[PDB]
Design a protein around this ligand. Structure first.
Ligand SMILES: CNC(=O)c1ccc2nc(C)c3nnc(-c4ccccc4Cl)n3c2c1
Ligand SMILES: [Mg+2]
Ligand SMILES: [Zn+2]
Length: 342
């Protein structure tokens, strides 16, 4: 069996030093999607070790190895919402830890919850959004639609189901209080990945940035965790143009597949999920201006060392404007034919 051999190696071979993964592994310039997928579970362990969580929380290595593989196995393979997304999001959490001195802002257990939440935050994603669950009358909507954030509730529930699998509860030696705290943190942080939640708390984030972070304010901790989570979730926008371009391709592949399903159900998809209407450069510029850039601006406001992240997103946004003209067909198409007009 596959998982069994992978597990055996992960547990008995030893945790590789993080520098051995890549010389620039802890840099904001590093693109974790460059790491071969077969190397990523070891990289998770290497990051957990380097952040001192294995030692600090006395995590059982067999349990942790099993847990990491179960989380990986808990992702399906849609174009974007797959394990390499969760891996890259987790990697950015590690970058925030290594570059922004999170221990001046957050409790140890909060930073640990943030990382584990990143790993788990899109578990069992099917490549469709919350609206689709309701529209298609899915099982997930049957369970959670009365509460909202249907997919995010499912991701959290899946994380808990993994913990509740024998041999996989990396927290089961925790005190009752700490165990309760960890799972509550995972709830809040994973539910924060619904962009509707982000938009709802945005004014509160603004207020916090403007008055100044108060480490003695429990609501500030909660708000900061949400902002950091979102920052990890969108972190593909903080790399180079090539990453932003590829991830646009993956996201719209996923969106358009959902739109096709909606049309087949007799429903009119959102414009951004309709391959006949969606104009990608404008949709991506809107996403960047309306969502991504303000998030990284807030991050910069709270952490001056995060300035380069905001400048990168802004740069990538400008690059969308610069390449937009290429979506207009000038001259004849590739094949010298106007057959596509029919
Ligand atoms: C209503 N609009 C969108 O849900 C939407 C539109 C355009 C995006 N564009 C990009 C690059 C992106 N990256 N992550 C997300 C993302 C974040 C959280 C959940 C799901 C996704 Cl898909 N998004 C986009 C999201
Ligand atoms: Mg999600
Ligand atoms: Zn995500």
């Amino acid at each position: 069996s596959a998982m069994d051999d992978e597990y055996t190696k992960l547990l008995h071979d030893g945790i590789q030093p993080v520098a051995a993964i890549d010389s620039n592994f802890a840099s904001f310039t590093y693109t974790p999607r460059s790491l071969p997928e077969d190397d990523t579970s070891m990289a998770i362990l290497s990051m957990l070790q380097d952040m001192n969580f294995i030692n600090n929380y006395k995590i059982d290595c067999p349990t942790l190895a099993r847990f990491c593989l179960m989380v990986k196995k808990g992702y399906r393979d849609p174009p974007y919402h797959n394990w390499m997304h969760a891996f890259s999001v987790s990697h950015f959490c590690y970058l925030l830890y290594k570059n922004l001195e999170l221990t001046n802002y957050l409790e140890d257990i909060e930073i640990f919850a943030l990382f584990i939440s990143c790993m788990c935050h899109d578990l069992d994603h099917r490549g469709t959004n919350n609206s689709f669950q309701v529209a298609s009358k899915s099982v997930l909507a049957a369970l959670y639609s009365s509460e909202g954030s249907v997919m995010e509730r499912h991701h959290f529930a899946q994380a808990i189901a993994i913990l509740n699998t024998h041999g996989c509860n990396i927290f089961d030696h925790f005190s009752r209080k700490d165990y309760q705290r960890m799972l509550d943190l995972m709830r809040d942080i994973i539910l924060a990945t619904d962009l509707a939640h982000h938009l709802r708390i945005f004014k509160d984030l603004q207020k916090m940035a403007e008055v100044g972070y108060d480490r003695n304010n429990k609501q500030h901790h909660r708000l900061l965790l949400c902002l950091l989570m979102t920052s990890c979730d969108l972190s593909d926008q903080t790399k180079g143009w090539k990453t932003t371009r590829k991830i646009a391709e993956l996201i719209y592949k996923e969106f358009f597949s959902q739109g096709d399903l909606e049309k087949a159900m007799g429903n009119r998809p959102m414009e951004m999920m309709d391959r006949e209407k969606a104009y990608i450069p404008e949709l991506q510029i809107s996403f960047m201006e309306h969502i991504a850039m303000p998030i990284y601006k807030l991050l910069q406001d709270l952490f001056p060392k995060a300035a380069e992240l905001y400048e990168r997103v802004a740069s990538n946004r400008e690059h969308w404007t610069k390449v937009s003209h290429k979506f207009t067909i000038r001259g004849l198409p590739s094949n010298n034919s106007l057959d596509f007009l029919d």
